[PDB]
Amino acid sequence: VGACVLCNSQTSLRCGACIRRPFLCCKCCYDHVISTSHKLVLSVNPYVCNAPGCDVTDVTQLYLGGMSYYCKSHKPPISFPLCANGQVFGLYKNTCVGSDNVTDFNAIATCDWTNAGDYILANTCTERLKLFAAETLKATEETFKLSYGIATVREVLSDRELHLSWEVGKPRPPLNRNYVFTGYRVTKNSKVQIGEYTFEKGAVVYRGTTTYKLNVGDYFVLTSHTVMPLSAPTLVPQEHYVRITGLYPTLNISDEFSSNVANYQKVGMQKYSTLQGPPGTGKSHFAIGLALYYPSARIVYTACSHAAVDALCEKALKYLPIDKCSRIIPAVECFDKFKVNSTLEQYVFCTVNALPETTADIVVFDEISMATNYDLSVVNARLRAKHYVYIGDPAQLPAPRTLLTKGTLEPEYFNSVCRLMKTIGPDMFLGTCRRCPAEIVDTVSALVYDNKLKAHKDKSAQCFKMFYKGVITHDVSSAINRPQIGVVREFLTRNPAWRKAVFISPYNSQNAVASKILGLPTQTVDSSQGSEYDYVIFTQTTETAHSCNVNRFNVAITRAKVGILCIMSDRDLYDKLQFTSLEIP
Numbered sequence: 001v002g003a004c005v006l007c008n009s010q011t012s013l014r015c016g017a018c019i020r021r022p023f024l025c026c027k028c029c030y031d032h033v034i035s036t037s038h039k040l041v042l043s044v045n046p047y048v049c050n051a052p053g054c055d056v057t058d059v060t061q062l063y064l065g066g067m068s069y070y071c072k073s074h075k076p077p078i079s080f081p082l083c084a085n086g087q088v089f090g091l092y093k094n095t096c097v098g099s100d101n102v103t104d105f106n107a108i109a110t111c112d113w114t115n116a117g118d119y120i121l122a123n124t125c126t127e128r129l130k131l132f133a134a135e136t137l138k139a140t141e142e143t144f145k146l147s148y149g150i151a152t153v154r155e156v157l158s159d160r161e162l163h164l165s166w167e168v169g170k171p172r173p174p175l176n177r178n179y180v181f182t183g184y185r186v187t188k189n190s191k192v193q194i195g196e197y198t199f200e201k202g203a204v205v206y207r208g209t210t211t212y213k214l215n216v217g218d219y220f221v222l223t224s225h226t227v228m229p230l231s232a233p234t235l236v237p238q239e240h241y242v243r244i245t246g247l248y249p250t251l252n253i254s255d256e257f258s259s260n261v262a263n264y265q266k267v268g269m270q271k272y273s274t275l276q277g278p279p280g281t282g283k284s285h286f287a288i289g290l291a292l293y294y295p296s297a298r299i300v301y302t303a304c305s306h307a308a309v310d311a312l313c314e315k316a317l318k319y320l321p322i323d324k325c326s327r328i329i330p331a332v333e334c335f336d337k338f339k340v341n342s343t344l345e346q347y348v349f350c351t352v353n354a355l356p357e358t359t360a361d362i363v364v365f366d367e368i369s370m371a372t373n374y375d376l377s378v379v380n381a382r383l384r385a386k387h388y389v390y391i392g393d394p395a396q397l398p399a400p401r402t403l404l405t406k407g408t409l410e411p412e413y414f415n416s417v418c419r420l421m422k423t424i425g426p427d428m429f430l431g432t433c434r435r436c437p438a439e440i441v442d443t444v445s446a447l448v449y450d451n452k453l454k455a456h457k458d459k460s461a462q463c464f465k466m467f468y469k470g471v472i473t474h475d476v477s478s479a480i481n482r483p484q485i486g487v488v489r490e491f492l493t494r495n496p497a498w499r500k501a502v503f504i505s506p507y508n509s510q511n512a513v514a515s516k517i518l519g520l521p522t523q524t525v526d527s528s529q530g531s532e533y534d535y536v537i538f539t540q541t542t543e544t545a546h547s548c549n550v551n552r553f554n555v556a557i558t559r560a561k562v563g564i565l566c567i568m569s570d571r572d573l574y575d576k577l578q579f580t581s582l583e584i585p
């Protein structure tokens with residue numbers, strides 16, 4: 001027994017063809033089954049034929065005959081159908097409202113999540129459907145990982161470098177940081193974990209969650225996890241207040257946090273508030289300042305990633321009493337300067353998926369472009385707070401959608417929070433970039449921030465662009481442009497100061513070629529989010545939807561504190577780069 005995801009109408013039926021098995025009310029369960037291929041229906045039992053060696057599972061072909069279900073062929077003389085009168089048979093048959101349409105719920109139940117349209121619906125539908133879609137999507141994602149063949153150690157060529165043998169009759173996953181494996185040592189009668197791992201073409205380069213002497217026979221699978229069902233909505237109901245509520249502001253604050261005093265007061269006068277923090281605008285500074293602004297307030301800092309939580313801790317450690325902080329870790333090496341797993345501590349830093357059930361004066365959820373509606377609902381489920389603050393930048397990168405191919409995902413559709421910020425705008429905006437040369441701030445202010453992002457720094461006059469399509473080659477799941485690395489090699493011979501530069505591209509394979517040929521440190525745009533470097537060399541590599549994503553581009557070029565070279569493929573973004581152009585040698 002449970003609740004109709006469309007009606008909430010109390011019900012005893014769950015669709016058994018739905019990977020999540022949502023409770024559906026007599027009306028909704030029927031409208032679902034007759035309007036899709038979903039025809040298996042589960043109650044306190046499964047509406048299948050209890051006839052010895054029959055295969056009938058279609059509820060539209062089955063009859064209650066006794067207290068046992070039968071198809072046409074096996075039914076007793078006395079039986080009534082399970083599925084008739086616009087209703088499917090179970091408990092609570094007289095309490096059942098239905099819906100005008102069930103069309104949206106069917107799409108969510110039946111979509112393969114390869115089309116942007118699927119994520120658009122999942123974010124424009126009613127809230128209980130946002131939860132259903134988010135479970136359905138996450139479970140589809142976890143199951144899709146199993147589809148991938150096991151990788152086994154055939155040889156150990158060196159340290160840091162391996163030979164892999166791959167399971168026949170199953171695709172192999174892309175070998176980039178988005179795909180995190182778990183290794184396993186072959187044992188007596190079973191297997192035991194041996195840390196997590198990531199791989200990259202050689203043979204294959206492996207960067208593991210610990211060191212070992214891993215030998216032949218050790219194998220790797222993308223560890224999938226159980227997706228629990230969602231209860232809480234993605235956003236609580238907004239409330240606006242006429243005074244600050246439940247928070248006591250400090251009388252004496254430092255001039256370091258003085259620029260956020262207005263914003264901190266906003267945070268005290270609504271239930272939840274959205275803060276858009278462009279690159280190098282002081283999001284963590286803002287997040288920690290709030291503590292000092294509300295000294296007695298219990299604050300739970302959360303983000304999706306251990307990295308994002310650890311950065312909050314690093315900042316905390318520079319301003320908040322250490323004895324008043326705890327880092328929450330479930331039984332990967334993360335921040336270890338606070339007492340560990342102390343939930344009643346005044347400042348609690350903790351990934352979403354590891355959050356305890358607890359209350360707080362404020363909840364700060366950071367790096368919000370990267371949250372899914374799944375993570376959103378989890379926080380509202382785990383954390384009951386007087387105020388919720390959502391800090392991120394919907395102009396930056398979202399969580400990868402491993403299943404998505406047909407369409408690009410716009411920021412309004414990354415999650416409920418980014419939807420709000422891109423539709424009703426953000427409650428709060430950090431409009432001064434302290435990181436980047438002016439030429440890079442002018443460029444992204446125009447590109448994605450409506451000319452509201454202002455440069456602290458002056459022009460560096462070390463921001464350059466080059467239009468060079470060169471030559472694109474493809475390997476199994478990535479792109480290479482050797483002539484764009486050539487141009488950069490030739491640029492470095494003539495500008496050797498630029499050998500302190502970080503190399504950034506949209507493709508881990510470009511990065512690997514570049515690392516060999518140039519010896520610069522490499523980052524994918526996606527791995528670079530949240531890091532800064534004085535000098536950045538950027539090869540677009542291709543003009544794909546991927547390599548022209550305006551959010552990826554925004555992140556690529558705002559990594560530079562001083563200078564950047566952008567070797568561009570796309571004539572559109574080359575022309576939006578407010579940078580000194582350079583000719584081709």
Ligand SMILES: N#Cc1ccc(Cn2cnc3ccccc32)cc1
Pocket residue numbers: 126127128129131231232233236237380381
């Ligand atoms: N869609 C939807 C949906 C709306 C409300 C609830 C009631 N509920 C349960 N847990 C909650 C936490 C915070 C706030 C409300 C909450 C459940 C699902």
Ligand SMILES: [Zn+2]
Pocket residue numbers: 015016017018032038109
């Ligand atoms: Zn179904």
Ligand SMILES: [Zn+2]
Pocket residue numbers: 004005006007008009024025026027028029096097098
């Ligand atoms: Zn219903």
Ligand SMILES: [Zn+2]
Pocket residue numbers: 049051054055056070071072073074
């Ligand atoms: Zn039968």
